[PDB]
Amino acid sequence: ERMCGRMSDFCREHKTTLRYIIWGILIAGYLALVIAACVMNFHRALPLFVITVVAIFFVVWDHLMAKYESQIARFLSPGQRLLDSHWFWLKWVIWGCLILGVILWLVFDTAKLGQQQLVSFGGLIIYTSLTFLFSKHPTKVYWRPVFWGIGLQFLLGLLILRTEPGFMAFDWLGKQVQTFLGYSDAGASFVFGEKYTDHFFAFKVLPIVIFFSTVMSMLYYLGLMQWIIRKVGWVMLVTMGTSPVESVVASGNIFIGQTESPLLVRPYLPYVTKSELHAIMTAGFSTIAGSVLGAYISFGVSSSHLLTASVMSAPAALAISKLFWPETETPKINLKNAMKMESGDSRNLLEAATQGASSSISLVANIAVNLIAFLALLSFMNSALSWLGNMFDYPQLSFEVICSYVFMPFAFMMGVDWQDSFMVAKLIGYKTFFNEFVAYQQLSKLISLRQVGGPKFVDGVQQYMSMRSEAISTYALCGFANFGSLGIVIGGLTSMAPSRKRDITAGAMRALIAGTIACFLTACIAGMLTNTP
Amino acid sequence: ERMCGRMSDFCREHKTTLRYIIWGILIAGYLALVIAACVMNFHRALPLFVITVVAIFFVVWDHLMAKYESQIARFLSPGQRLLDSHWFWLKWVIWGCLILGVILWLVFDTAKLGQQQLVSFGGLIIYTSLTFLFSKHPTKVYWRPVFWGIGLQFLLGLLILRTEPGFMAFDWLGKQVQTFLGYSDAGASFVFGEKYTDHFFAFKVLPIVIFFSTVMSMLYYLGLMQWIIRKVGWVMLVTMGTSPVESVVASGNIFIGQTESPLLVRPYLPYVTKSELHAIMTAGFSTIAGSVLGAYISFGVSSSHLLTASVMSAPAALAISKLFWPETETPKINLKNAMKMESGDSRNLLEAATQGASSSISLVANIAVNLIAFLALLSFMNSALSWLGNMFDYPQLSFEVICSYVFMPFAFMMGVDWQDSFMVAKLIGYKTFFNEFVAYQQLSKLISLRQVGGPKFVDGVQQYMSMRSEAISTYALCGFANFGSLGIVIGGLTSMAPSRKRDITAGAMRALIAGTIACFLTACIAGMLTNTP
Amino acid sequence: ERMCGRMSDFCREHKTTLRYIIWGILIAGYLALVIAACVMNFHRALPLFVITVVAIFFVVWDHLMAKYESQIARFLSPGQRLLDSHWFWLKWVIWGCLILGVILWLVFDTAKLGQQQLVSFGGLIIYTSLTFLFSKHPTKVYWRPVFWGIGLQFLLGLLILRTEPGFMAFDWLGKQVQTFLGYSDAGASFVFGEKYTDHFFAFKVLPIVIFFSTVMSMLYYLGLMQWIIRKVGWVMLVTMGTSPVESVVASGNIFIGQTESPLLVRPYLPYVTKSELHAIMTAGFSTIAGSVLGAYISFGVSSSHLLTASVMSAPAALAISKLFWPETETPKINLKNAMKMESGDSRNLLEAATQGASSSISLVANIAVNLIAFLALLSFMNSALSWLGNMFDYPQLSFEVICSYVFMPFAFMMGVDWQDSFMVAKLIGYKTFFNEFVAYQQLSKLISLRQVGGPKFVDGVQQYMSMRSEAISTYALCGFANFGSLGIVIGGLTSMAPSRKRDITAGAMRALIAGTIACFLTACIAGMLTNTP
Ligand SMILES: CC(C)C(=O)OC[C@H]1O[C@@H](n2ccc(NO)nc2=O)[C@H](O)[C@@H]1O
Ligand SMILES: CC(C)C(=O)OC[C@H]1O[C@@H](n2ccc(NO)nc2=O)[C@H](O)[C@@H]1O
Ligand SMILES: CC(C)C(=O)OC[C@H]1O[C@@H](n2ccc(NO)nc2=O)[C@H](O)[C@@H]1O
């Protein structure tokens, strides 16, 4: 007993020192492994070396910003005062310079590119103007978020699309995500057998959502997801001027789904304002999750365009939300509380994986059931429309024919040419009424037909559409905003915050419209920047 | 801002006028479409014209009954007083005339038809007498519901079975339902692949319940289901004399399942009397849903007989419930409250479809699991009975052999001939212990063997049975009254009304017996009316 | 009415007499059937005769112990006092005799058997010593439970393994269980079609858990499971000295799963001590359910070893729990309350079957989802470890290679030879991180390779391992203690007893370690007793 007591006292004495010592030993071992790999053959060890270097750089940066925050603020203070003193006369100068730059760039670039590239800018203007017209509180609007959101979208798109180094990186990332989620498909062979490919959607696609949920929960436990969310949220906060909680939600939605994204700020959902809840729902509707990215890239959809659309949507979502539901009340929640995200309560990583996996049981079931019902309804609708049309000697009437004409103006304003606007409109209808998975499937079919080659028109029916129309379609359809999905968002948000049940329902419908408009804005910028093939 | 205010004021001024104007414009457009279709080719446009005419007639009738209700009641009042004044002497005359008519019809018709047609009437009498013997409160019974229920059953059966125009309509309706639910099977190919037919029950049959639930929820939101329920309930109320809530539940169960039917009067379930709750459960047990109708017609079961059985069961259910659990306490719930059914809280049709689809997730899982367990138990029972029989040199002993002898008297009383009574008894055993899906499958096999032709007896075993026995079996087995299903009804009703948890359990067992007896009564009437082939 | 009243009075008079009369008539009929079967052909009727004789013997024994309990206690009292008076000097004599017997048996038997048979005893000592070292309260420990647990394990193993009559019985029981659960596989063909074998795990294996749950619920309703649990618990109680509730839980876990076993003492879970809750969790982790037994026997795993391991684990679980978390507080719960187990609330057997079947819906879904996620994670881990290894010119690095070296000492201490210890270590790693189903699959592959014959080493890789190593592996891996499974146990126990939510989490981790150590102890005894092939 005495020896055990002495050992316990020794352990108590060295607790912090011992933990630091063991962590340092582990880090030194990792560095030794890296250096050995570099010694033997640097070329093979290049990825590991790059990862280590970037990790060290980020850790050093974080530590310095933490410790030296006061000194940096002291250095920055005089410039802020000098700017404030001269801001009155300088604001007009800055605004004029920005307008002149916009005019010069638009004229030269787009005028040389063609007419269709300019109709996209016209559509950008039209969408923003219409959203201003039908705003909930038109009189009280803050324009800084809107302008900064559009500007950030333009800059990100310009870098990624007009620079070869920028274009290559997102392709690489898309391939990595595809492989990582393809690890899931192999793992699901065990449960459903090697004949799981017989039932593709049930036994191949849905298990990818289970694997993605597990991985996301593990990363949440470790504390990485939070880091990236904080960085992007700080960028948006320091430029757009939005509130903290909505920024954190928006940055998270780049990779997290709509159902799970509010869990980041769950503890403060009871106290959020109506505008912030509308922003949350709009961000949820305007962006897709990482799980679907691999499947959509597999269909044939471009990795670069999908990732760029997902990144660009969140600033667009916040801007459109502010222009479609401006805030009229003070925000209670603080920056420190919002940025802080409680880690998973699971004791160990494997418990976090188990809990993340179990949660996915509801989602997959709901998805499968909704798909069954809605596709059966589509079949009934087509048969009845054909029956009605036969009376008027037009047996070809269908959902697609109606939706081609109904949604054509939106496609034309986005910069799609007149002939292909109808084809894009059919896909938009599929995305709105049914989910975007079906729409991406149809788009993949059209892309494959273009790649195979052959007659553009077999008969007076067009078979495939141009590449730029496909890019604009990729941007436009990159969302979770479908009417069938309105119920699940409401139910989840009500579950997380029962007190706010009424506010969630009141603003739910406007959020879907805002998300669609945000996707359209991303598409318009893409059309402005992509050249005519 | 001023222009927006002026527009808002103008919108406020014209609200009702504007809504009426737009609705009128839409109706005028529909009428123009109909008239154009009739102009071009009337023969093709015949269905649309008929639908429009009947809809207009019903709307006019409803409006007139609403506005002119007081005048019609004033016109009707004197006749009621005149009847009441002379009722004392006239009641004996009416009863004697009815008895004489019954005697004359029975003698002529059934005596010419044969002995078996008359044993069915004998069985009708026997079942009613036995239910009177073992009633919960034999002394206090109201005979008007029982007599009116039997009479309405007889009239509906006579019209549908003995009139060619009546017979054709239900066949048409069954075909329509089959097609509408076959739209579901096509829609479920997407989720489970084109190889979904490999697993028929899991991937073909169960999805039909999901599609049916979605459609029923949408129609509930629109307000049609309620209209039909109200009409049939009013008929039963004005003739049988039952209470409002039980009548509404009974009329709804013609097409709605047992689990979902109480949701029509959910708000008042806490306050219903014990007799009314017994009536609710009995109606649930004695009738089948619309989802199963398409499958059962597909197996080979007659559409006309299935629909006629479903329609006839509800009056039989109410009559048998009143004779098996007569009411001893005053009914609190009013006619207006009961007839009124709250529409779905879903904001839009698509939300209603989503909510209806999500609810079906539990039901399909419970059904599949119960089927697995109970069929495995049947396999074990057969193997052990064969093992026991081998000791006594009878290795053929099985569940079917025991159930053929046990249930034979019920089949004989229903009017089935002696030879086929055992075959019907096997099916009744399958229906009672396991669900009626298996029983309908066996019945379909026997029907197919009859249709193919061949030896009636391959050896001293009969292979197929006569057509009339099949009709009586179709009527007898048309129910959801199985012992495995007792749990789900109790759980659902307890969920809807937690306060009444004890009353639900106390009367649950008697309800199953009452439902079986009601199915037997429908079968007896069918046997009385169907001629010997 | 008067006749009904007279009949009711007559029924009231004879209630108990009538029930006894009918039960006696049924029993007499059963005896008549048995005697007829014996008359015709005794040899065929032998199983029925044996079952009847044993049932009669047990009923007579139970009745006599009930009625004559006081007389038996009176007879036993003097001997207890005489033993207590002389216990002071006799305890040393008894302990010395036991030690001398242990020494003599160990020397003769194991020394003749070989070195490996003795390293197993050494490992037994090592595991017990280590558990004593790292105990929660090392100072306060009761050694009687530990010593009695080890002794009972040794006696059961000796009987079952070293006696031919003992060995044959468990093989017979395993075959019976396999057949009874194979009844399930046939019954599940209906729901998933005859092509259900295409997806083996989803459509063949998981349905066996549904059938097992249904059967267990029915037996719980009837009152058999409880009888066996009480008998085994009384044995453990009268020898080990443990508390009642933990003994009841431990005896139940021989055949009941971890998720469902606490339901036996659910009503008193709010009041159990921390030590008893740790014992419950340890018993849950150290034993497998009956559902998996048929599958594992089908793979090729020996029936006798599996059943012996399951039986031996529970005393080991209790002993290791007492040595790893000794009790420091008084136990409130009484023997009578704990032994009594409330029967199912279901009114009839079929309701119990339905309720048992419905409960399984959650378990199968959780199992399937966890398997998908964890196997996908294994695939990712292997690919990344291979990628890292390629840098150091060792592309074969994998999870298996690391786990072979990490877990080798445990396998060596269990008595496995040096060459096969690595192969066993791989299986132990599979069991710990992933569930034991995968590990048993790999073990079945190795057994099949041994049985086919061929090169022991195709190259410098060993292909199959010796029979004794397979037996030790069968004992070692016979558990539900996997890290993925930690979450489900916590969630279920928290659901049953919400008040104790914190105590459940605090002691959850130690329980898994204790369960693994208990499995290792069973393996060590098996290695000590099994001879070298
Ligand atoms: C299986 C996938 C590819 C699919 O078919 O998606 C259809 C609908 O499922 C919703 N969804 C999906 C994933 C998610 N997190 O991973 N959250 C969601 O809400 C979302 O509305 C979408 O449209
Ligand atoms: C899939 C269908 C054809 C089936 O196999 O039915 C078996 C059992 O499922 C119950 N059931 C079914 C549908 C329903 N609403 O659509 N409510 C119910 O309660 C009912 O007891 C029946 O016997
Ligand atoms: C389908 C079976 C063979 C399987 O693959 O099992 C994997 C994991 O499922 C857990 N499990 C299983 C059954 C049960 N009662 O029958 N209770 C449980 O907890 C347990 O942890 C095991 O490791």
Side-chain angles (χ1 to χ4, degrees), chain C residues 216-331 333-335 337-341 343-346 348-392:
Chain C
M216 298 285 279
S217 69
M218 298 199 310
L219 297 178
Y220 199 75
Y221 172 75
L222 299 174
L224 296 172
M225 193 194 311
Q226 299 155 3
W227 178 70
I228 326 171
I229 295 169
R230 290 194 190 99
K231 311 278 271 195
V232 189
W234 183 85
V235 171
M236 296 183 187
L237 192 72
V238 82
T239 47
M240 286 187 67
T242 40
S243 308
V245 177
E246 47 177 354
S247 303
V248 161
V249 171
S251 39
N253 289 29
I254 295 171
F255 22 96
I256 309 154
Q258 59 170 9
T259 50
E260 306 97 347
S261 56
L263 301 171
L264 308 166
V265 292
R266 179 190 177 89
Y268 326 99
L269 287 178
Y271 320 113
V272 293
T273 72
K274 299 183 184 179
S275 176
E276 294 175 354
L277 201 49
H278 181 256
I280 290 175
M281 304 187 85
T282 306
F285 285 132
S286 60
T287 51
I288 67 173
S291 52
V292 307
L293 190 71
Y296 296 158
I297 298 173
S298 303
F299 290 158
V301 190
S302 188
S303 34
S304 175
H305 290 119
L306 273 171
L307 279 160
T308 310
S310 304
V311 175
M312 288 172 53
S313 285
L318 291 185
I320 289 295
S321 167
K322 306 319 280 184
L323 192 50
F324 205 57
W325 193 310
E327 196 169 12
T328 57
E329 39 188 347
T330 56
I333 308 177
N334 193 27
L335 176 65
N337 307 340
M339 285 297 177
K340 161 236 299 177
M341 308 162 212
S343 293
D345 60 355
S346 296
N348 57 348
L349 197 58
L350 296 175
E351 265 193 16
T354 310
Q355 184 176 0
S358 299
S359 299
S360 75
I361 294 168
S362 309
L363 178 65
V364 298
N366 291 349
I367 292 176
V369 166
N370 294 12
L371 266 164
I372 293 172
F374 274 66
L375 268 46
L377 292 169
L378 174 61
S379 185
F380 170 61
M381 184 193 310
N382 290 349
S383 77
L385 284 171
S386 180
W387 173 69
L388 180 61
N390 204 0
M391 296 176 182
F392 310 115

Side-chain angles (χ1 to χ4, degrees), chain B residues 45-66 68-80 82-83 85-87 89-196:
Chain B
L46 187 58
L48 188 57
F49 182 73
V50 171
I51 296 175
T52 309
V53 167
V54 303
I56 292 180
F57 160 72
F58 279 120
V59 171
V60 171
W61 170 273
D62 297 356
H63 173 74
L64 291 180
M65 301 311 284
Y68 284 13
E69 200 173 3
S70 63
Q71 314 175 11
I72 300 171
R74 192 178 309 176
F75 166 72
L76 289 177
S77 175
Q80 183 69 24
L82 188 66
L83 183 64
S85 305
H86 296 92
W87 183 235
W89 74 266
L90 193 56
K91 60 183 179 182
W92 307 104
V93 179
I94 295 297
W95 299 342
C97 287
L98 287 161
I99 294 178
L100 185 64
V102 169
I103 294 178
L104 292 176
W105 163 269
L106 178 67
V107 170
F108 298 139
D109 199 13
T110 57
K112 293 301 177 60
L113 295 167
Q115 184 191 12
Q116 300 301 325
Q117 272 73 18
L118 190 146
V119 179
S120 308
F121 174 72
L124 173 58
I125 292 186
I126 288 177
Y127 284 121
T128 309
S129 306
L130 290 186
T131 56
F132 176 58
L133 290 185
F134 302 91
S135 172
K136 186 84 176 193
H137 316 104
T139 55
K140 314 169 188 175
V141 179
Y142 196 21
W143 286 104
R144 186 195 178 193
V146 183
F147 285 132
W148 266 108
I150 296 184
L152 295 178
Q153 294 179 72
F154 177 82
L155 291 174
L156 301 174
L158 200 67
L159 177 75
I160 301 168
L161 298 173
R162 297 260 187 171
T163 70
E164 171 244 358
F167 203 87
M168 287 182 173
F170 282 70
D171 272 6
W172 185 75
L173 291 171
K175 303 307 187 306
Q176 303 322 291
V177 175
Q178 179 181 4
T179 304
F180 183 78
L181 297 165
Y183 286 141
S184 65
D185 296 354
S189 176
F190 167 87
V191 184
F192 303 117
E194 287 183 352
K195 295 170 178 293
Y196 72 116

Side-chain angles (χ1 to χ4, degrees), chain A residues 190, chain C residues 201 205-206 209 212-213 256-260 289-292 295-296 363 367 371 435-437 479-482 485 488-489:
Chain A
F190 167 87
Chain C
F201 186 85
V205 176
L206 279 169
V209 166
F212 173 77
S213 299
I256 309 154
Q258 59 170 9
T259 50
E260 306 97 347
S291 52
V292 307
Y296 296 158
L363 178 65
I367 292 176
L371 266 164
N435 46 45
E436 75 290 341
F437 182 91
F480 277 0
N482 50 293
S485 185
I488 57 172
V489 181

Side-chain angles (χ1 to χ4, degrees), chain A residues 33 37 44 47-48 180 183-184 187 190-192 195 199 203 207 210-211 214 218 348 350-351 354 357-358 360-361, chain C residues 198-199 201-202 366 369-377 380 383 387 390-393 437 441 483-484 486 490:
Chain A
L33 294 174
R44 286 188 312 180
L48 188 57
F180 183 78
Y183 286 141
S184 65
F190 167 87
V191 184
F192 303 117
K195 295 170 178 293
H199 319 282
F203 296 172
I210 300 168
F211 177 61
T214 300
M218 298 199 310
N348 57 348
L350 296 175
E351 265 193 15
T354 310
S358 299
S360 75
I361 294 168
Chain C
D198 290 359
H199 319 282
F201 186 85
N366 291 349
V369 166
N370 294 12
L371 266 164
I372 293 172
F374 274 66
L375 268 46
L377 292 169
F380 170 61
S383 77
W387 173 69
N390 204 0
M391 296 176 182
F392 310 115
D393 292 356
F437 182 91
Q441 211 158 4
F483 277 120
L486 184 60
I490 295 174

